[PDB]
Amino acid sequence: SKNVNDLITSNTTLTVVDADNSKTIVPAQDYLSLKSQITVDDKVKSGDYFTIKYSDTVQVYGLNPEDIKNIGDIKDPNNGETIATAKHDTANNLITYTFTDYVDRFNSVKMGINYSIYMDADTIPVDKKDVPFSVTIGNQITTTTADITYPAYKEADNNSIGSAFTETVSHVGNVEDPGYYNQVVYVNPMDKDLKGAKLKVEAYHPKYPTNIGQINQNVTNIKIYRVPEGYTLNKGYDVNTNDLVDVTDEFKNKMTYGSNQSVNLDFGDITSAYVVMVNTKFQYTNSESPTLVQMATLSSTGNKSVSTGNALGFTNQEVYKIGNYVWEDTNKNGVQELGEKGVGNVTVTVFDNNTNTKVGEAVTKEDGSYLIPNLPNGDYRVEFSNLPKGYEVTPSKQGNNEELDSNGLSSVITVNGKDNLSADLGIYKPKY
């Protein structure tokens, strides 16, 4: 088991996508498209591993940290097998992929990845031109740049405010735990002297009567921090709380929950900026496409009230695959071995063996692969036919391993809670 970064080579693209066509690049709105075709040296063996490292300005999820699951094992799309398993170490900006026995069973291994990844605002607190974003696949660095341009804080007279959703874990349709979301509110980011300041945060908007936002004393947790003099707030709403002064204890008597998913924070007379962190639980919903809206309004004496807010939309038996290999069993021993190659143009026909009803069919590709999808748990008869002329069927069920043997022309396999890729056929062509 060793690092084989020097035994892969890739054609990689890393592209900044202006997702909202704003003509500006903002971490909260835009994203990075990473694509790579990776060629793996034949010397690589199972348990070897390669890494994908990304720069400090890159992260592998957006608002939902559970989206890390979208960047997972690398699979062969033709035959359904896993080529390498993925392990994230987000603290080290690292993905480690460990090769499976795929690379012991096949030469000329090639892999594709197609990921959406995200910009990390942690080190981009303000507008900056030519910010680099880098991904290192094996030993090859792919670097792209973009100008980062954040929106301005909302203002009304001497009142100013900003807000963003910073984390959303939504389980739409789950009654036990609908999930949670976090919002950050910058209070008075323009650093003014405001008289009788009050902040109203509300999961309420007249346009959204089915809002799944929720604010009340039982589900909501609020932290308040004072911003030191001269501190530059992160315009991407990445808050390093160690840089700020926790003043949550000072907002007893000043914290009031109210109707329509509201909470009111009485700041009084203030001369600094404040960061308000709001953690709260989603409401449950039956709907397929719910909406979350949460507003924040700062009011003070002698100034127009300023409002800002954020809005987001969300989304709400098992079947499996059978396969997957017809190969030319050169040494006739009935066992799939490295260097023996797949056979194309062989017909596979699959039946539910308990009803004798046809459930799928395929023709093997040039690499010998086939897949039969959409099969629930059951017993399935797999019939091979239309072998190449001159070829004979190799001996069946050799080698004491039903994943590496030949099933013969007709056999029955059981699908039980996972893909069953063990219905394989070995053939050879006699010369004598």
* Residues binding Ca ion (CB under 5 A): 18, 20, 22, 29-30, 42, 44, 103, 324-325, 329, 331, 333, 335, 337, 402, 405, 407, 421-422, 424
**Smallest separation (angstroms) from Ca ion to the CB of 244:** 28
Q: Closest approach of Cβ 338 to Ca ion, in Å?
A: 8
Nearer to Ca ion, 104 or 266 (CB): 104
**Quick one: 379 or 402, whose CB is closer to Ca ion?**
402
If the CB atoms of residues 173 and 395 are measured against Ca ion, the closer one turns out to be: 395
Residue 238 or 337 with smaller CB distance to Ca ion: 337
Nearest distance in Å: CB 247, Ca ion: 34
By the 10 Å C-beta count (0-12 exposed, 13-18 middle, 19+ buried), 69 is classed as exposed
- Give CA–CA dist 196/267, Å, rounded: 7
Please tell me whether residue 386 adopts helix, strand or coil conformation.
Answer: coil
241 or 331: whose CB is closer to Ca ion?
331
Least distance in angstroms from the C-beta of 64 to Ca ion: 19
Residue closest to Ca ion, measured at CB = 22
Number of other CB atoms surrounding residue 307 within 10 Å: 16
Return the amino acid letter for 315.
Answer: T
- State the minimum distance, in angstroms, from the CB of residue 30 to Ca ion: 4
Q: Please provide residue 368's backbone torsions phi and psi, each rounded to the nearest 5 degrees.
A: 85, 5
Closest CA relative to residue 370, chosen from 417, 333, 419, 414? 419
Considering the complex, what minimum distance in angstroms separates the CB of residue 181 from Ca ion?
Answer: 22
First CA to last CA distance, the chain: 43
Of 29 and 271, which CB lies nearer to Ca ion in the complex structure? 29
- Determine if the peptide bond prior to 353 is cis (ω within 30°): no
DSSP of 78-108 = TT--EEEEEEEEGGGTEEEEEE-THHHH-SS
Nearer to Ca ion, 46 or 272 (CB): 46
Which string of b and e fits 178-193 if b means at least 16 CB within 10 Å? bbbbbbbbbbbbeebe
Tokens of 412: 């029955």
The DSSP symbol for 303 reads: S
User: Nearest approach, Cβ of 292 to Ca ion (angstroms)?
Assistant: 21
